[PDB]
Design a protein around this nucleic acid. Structure first.
Lengths: 103, 110, 150, 142, 48, 56, 117
RNA sequence: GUAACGGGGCUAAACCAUGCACCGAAGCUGCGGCAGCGACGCUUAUGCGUUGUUGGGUAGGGGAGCGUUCUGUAAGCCUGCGAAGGUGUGCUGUGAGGCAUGCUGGAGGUAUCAGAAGUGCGAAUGCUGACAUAAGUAACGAUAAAGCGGGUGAAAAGCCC
RNA sequence: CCCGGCGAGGGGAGUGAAAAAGAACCUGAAACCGUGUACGUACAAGCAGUGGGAGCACGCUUAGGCGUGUGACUGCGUACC
């Protein structure tokens, strides 16, 4: 069963039994993630809702890993001119696993 | 049971050896030894003694049987060249390189 | 580079490198372009910085308890087996012996030991003095060092 | 999260029979091209050639509307003789009668290869004689 | 012993340009002299 | 002529695929003996359809 | 002080050529061509961080479009209708039900049609 | 070679008048990471917290850091109970870099931190070595040619007969 | 001892701590050509890279949507001095 939530200024589709990724949390592996900020649950048929944070909804979750990814590389460059420069970032994240989503 | 035969500094350019060798890659020893026999070329008799020597020390010595023996590696490498002056226009004295080959047979039961 | 002023040269603009000189630094071997010249790095050493840095190290050497300051520390002869046998008894190793009195029977002593060394208190070396375990000193050395430092 | 995407084994296609006798060339043609990509349906994928399988039932009486019919001469320059060389709208109907519909739907399809993969799903035949009776065509009005 | 734990007075070490090292470095080619002209080459021509 | 660049090693092998040394297509026995053969010649001992050949 | 010159570069080279594994021909074996390609590769990789999200939004828009068009409204009257209709933060990526189980999508359209003017 | 809408197509799918719409960039914005610096707090040669505008950048300045050869602590400690070197992978930092680890290896190795410098190559139509390439291409040096059988020899169209 | 022309080269047997020290013998890259495995290449075309991806092998993925290598296909896309 599918639902929409907010990771932040970004919104996420997710299902039941789905492990899904977002920007790092304070919440640990050994703790409970729960979302009262459910924007819809798409239920048995299309939902007709206007107003978000549906009360008769939860996505109950858990963290399943907090880690850091691989290192991505950033190039700023301009040819023939002898301008080249670089920055890295690897970024922290959380993976969460969805146990929730009521019918 | 594995055997190397080499003949190094043998009188062929290694490009001309690699030609014949690619006919007999992976063939098993008896099927390749027939393929070589009905190759008339002088290169094919030169290589025969080295391929046959590989096959002979399994048929003897430390080995047992030659029926699952296969030509596991067969490869040829640049041997030592003697360098000679090529006659050429306007008394141009450019190098011509007179090649030899380092020939490797490896046979194994593998 | 000596032994040829020859130019391989025979112009540029003939399909090849400039081939400039047979003594040019890049010419395989025989000499490279900035290779070393005789180096001398010693300076003047400014007396008021020198003498006042030292006043710091002599205070720090008592504050870390490394200055023993034995009265007329000496041995009969400049023999290592005698000084060393004195050192085993005092339970000491690898120490800087400082003469106050420039007597030859301590000053020529200690020679066989690797990391025991003898120096005179006149113009004491500030780099050796931060190494070693302890500074043995005499009270004679304290007298003439403070006197180089006023 | 990441986006979902489609795959070649799950694509359905079906066989569609498109009646053309009321229609006109380009208003058939641009709907066919759309459908022939899968751009009429939710593709949700960049890389899988979807499309429908299209039988055109006839199409022999498709007007072009307006004066464009008599200046449409399908210009090509294969490799010989000064001048552009051509073939008439009239050649396309009199012989192999599809070809006017084919080379109307050609120009709506992508670059080299991908535009050919979309096209080999479409058929017209000679007209009012199609062979997909066993195939069970779903009729479509456009 | 306390040796090998020293360092210079605050901001006293300028460290200075090495030049000619890397191409992604900012610093490199010519010396801080720009492209071509008399002052880009090794020391010759004009009198002080 | 000359050439633009030094060629790739895949090129060298495509160029060599057709020039490659060709099969012997298995072997022969005599139609008329238990003697081994050379295909569509007569042996050193004259066996092919008998008689005698190469009496040197 | 003889300094060796080049046992530092042997490692710098090896970092570039390891990043240039999976690349063709010289690209995985010559530092000169490895170096051109590794700079180019990361410029593109970093470009496509942003560019991937824009290229998909086009596939996102065409899939809300095919559901709506089957339901006899155009995408822009439906999205503007939803805008006029109350709150919902929403999204173009939302209708999974567009590709499969195509029975749904109707409540959102029926809402969008109701707000339309 | 259409090729003066980019093309198909369009005789309304055009253009014109009024007006609504959507899509459309790292822009506008929130989420999470972070740089420096003003204000305030702690109060440090290179900061961080609260709060804040900010962070495209060459020539060019200026500040900081890494490694490479060698010195000092290092005449010490670790070592055939497996050292340098070689190489694949993973971890980690903004990057330079640094660290773990199987294989390999048969003797060597080590910071911190300061200071000395022959101090990092990818180019000079650069210099030297190993060694590739166009290529299974072209070549048979006035064609004072040559034959095939037997024989020296293991072998012979070229020697010897 | 095996192959071979009295040859050349290599292996076996035996030597040693080691011959993955075998005589150009020190440990040993990369250029070089070959083997062996996995996977790919005949609706099929460009700086060969990026982004999305059918597939298959392996990793018991405690299988719980994940790791690895390669990748039909295809959105996008102009080398360095």
């Amino acid at each position: 069963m599918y639902a929409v939530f907010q990771s932040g200024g970004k919104q996420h589709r997710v299902s039941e039994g789905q492990t899904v990724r977002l920007e790092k949390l304070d919440i640990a592996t050994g703790e409970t993630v729960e979302f009262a900020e459910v924007l819809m649950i798409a239920n048995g048929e299309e939902v007709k809702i206007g107003v978000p944070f549906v009360d008769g909804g939860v996505i109950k979750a858990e963290v399943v890993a907090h880690g850091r990814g691989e290192k991505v590389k950033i190039v700023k460059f301009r040819r023939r001119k002898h301008y080249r420069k670089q920055q890295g970032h690897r970024q922290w994240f959380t993976d969460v696993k969805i146990t929730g989503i009521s019918a | 049971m594995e055997t190397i035969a080499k003949h190094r500094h043998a009188r062929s350019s290694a490009q001309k050896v690699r030609l014949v060798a690619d006919l007999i890659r992976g063939k098993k020893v008896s099927q390749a030894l027939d393929i070589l026999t009905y190759t008339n070329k002088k290169a094919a008799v030169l290589v025969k003694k080295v391929l046959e020597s590989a096959i002979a020390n399994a048929e003897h010595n430390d080995g047992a049987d030659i029926d699952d023996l296969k030509v596991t590696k067969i490869f040829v490498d640049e041997g030592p060249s003697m360098k000679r002056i090529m006659p050429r226009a306007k008394g141009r004295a450019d190098r011509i390189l007179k090649r030899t080959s380092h020939i490797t047979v490896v046979v194994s039961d593998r | 580079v000596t032994g040829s002023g020859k130019k391989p040269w025979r112009q540029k603009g003939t399909g090849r490198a400039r081939s400039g000189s047979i003594k040019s630094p890049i010419w395989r071997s025989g000499g490279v372009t900035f290779a070393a010249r005789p180096q001398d790095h010693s300076q003047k050493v400014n007396k008021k910085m020198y003498r006042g840095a030292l006043k710091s190290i002599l205070s720090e050497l008592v504050r870390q308890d490394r200055l023993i300051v034995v009265e007329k520390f000496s041995v009969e002869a400049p023999k290592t087996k005698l000084l060393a046998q004195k050192l085993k008894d005092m339970a000491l190793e690898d120490v800087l012996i400082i003469t106050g009195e420039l007597d030859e029977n301590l000053f020529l002593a200690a020679r066989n030991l690797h990391k025991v060394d003898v120096r005179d208190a006149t113009g004491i070396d500030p780099v050796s003095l931060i190494a070693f375990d302890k500074v043995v000193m005499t009270a004679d050395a304290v007298k003439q060092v403070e006197e180089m430092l006023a | 999260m990441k986006t979902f995407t489609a795959k070649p084994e799950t694509v359905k296609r079906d066989w569609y029979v498109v009646d053309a006798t009321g229609k006109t060339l380009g208003r058939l043609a641009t709907e066919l091209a759309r459908r022939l990509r899968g751009k009429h349906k939710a593709e949700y994928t960049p890389h899988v050639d979807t499309g429908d399988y299209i039988i055109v039932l006839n199409a022999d009486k498709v007007a072009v509307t307006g004066n464009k019919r008599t200046d449409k001469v399908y210009y090509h320059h294969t490799g010989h003789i000064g001048g552009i060389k051509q073939a008439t709208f009239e050649e396309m109907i009199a012989r192999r009668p599809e070809r006017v519909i084919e080379i109307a739907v050609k120009g709506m399809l992508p670059k080299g290869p991908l535009g050919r993969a979309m096209f080999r799903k479409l058929k017209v035949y000679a007209g009012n004689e199609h062979n997909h009776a066993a195939q069970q065509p779903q009729v479509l009005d456009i | 012993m306390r040796l090998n734990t020293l360092s210079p007075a605050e901001g006293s070490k300028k460290a200075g340009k090495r030049l000619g090292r890397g191409i992604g470095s900012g610093l490199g080619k010519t010396g801080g002299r720009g492209h071509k002209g008399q002052k880009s080459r090794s020391g010759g021509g004009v009198r002080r | 002529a000359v050439q633009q660049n030094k060629p790739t090693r895949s090129k060298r092998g495509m160029r060599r695929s057709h020039d490659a040394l060709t099969a012997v297509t298995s072997l022969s026995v005599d139609k008329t003996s238990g003697e081994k053969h050379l295909r569509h010649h007569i042996t050193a001992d004259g066996y092919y359809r008998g008689r005698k050949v190469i009496a040197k | 002080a003889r300094v060796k010159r080049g046992v530092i570069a042997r490692a710098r080279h090896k970092k570039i050529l390891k990043q240039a594994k999976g690349y063709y021909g010289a690209r995985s074996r010559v530092y000169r061509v490895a170096f051109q390609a590794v700079i180019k590769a990361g410029q593109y990789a970093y470009r496509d961080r942003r560019q991937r999200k824009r290229q998909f939004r086009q596939l996102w828009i065409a899939r809300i479009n095919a559901a709506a068009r089957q339901n006899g409204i155009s995408y822009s009257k439906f999205i503007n209708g939803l805008k006029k209709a109350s709150v919902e933060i929403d999204r173009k990526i939302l209708a999974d039900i567009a590709v499969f189980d195509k029975v749904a999508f109707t409540a959102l359209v029926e809402k969008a049609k109701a707000a339309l003017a």
